[PDB]
């Protein structure tokens, strides 16, 4: 007699992980970037760059 074409089956599980990193900003160099108080010459200065 002939043979029937078998086929398989499997169930795989997702194994979960996570990686994380971080940095930090100084309080001194904080107000130099965001704050819109710097009017005329402190927007294009060397310290802000």
């Amino acid at each position: 007699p002939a043979d029937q074409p078998v086929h398989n089956y499997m169930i795989k599980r997702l194994d979960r992980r996570s990686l994380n990193a971080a940095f930090s900003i100084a309080v001194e160099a904080l107000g130099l970037i965001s704050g819109e108080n710097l009017d005329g010459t402190h927007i294009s200065s060397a310290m802000r760059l």
């Binding site: 001194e28 160099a29 107000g31 130099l32 108080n37 710097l38 402190h42 200065s45 310290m47 802000r48």
Partner: protein
């Protein structure tokens, strides 16, 4: 109730002693020294120095 009579510094008298000027980025640039000398006068004494 009672109010809080505010007082301005520039409208005081002591303001004559000091020149006040706002320096926004100082706390950042305060990491190093500023270090400016001033002067010293000198008489022209006779005889070769």
């Amino acid at each position: 109730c009672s109010t809080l009579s505010l007082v301005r510094f520039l409208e005081l008298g002591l303001s004559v002693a000091c020149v006040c000027t706002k320096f926004p980025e100082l706390s950042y640039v305060a990491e190093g020294t500023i270090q400016f000398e001033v002067q010293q006068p000198m008489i022209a004494r006779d005889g070769p120095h």
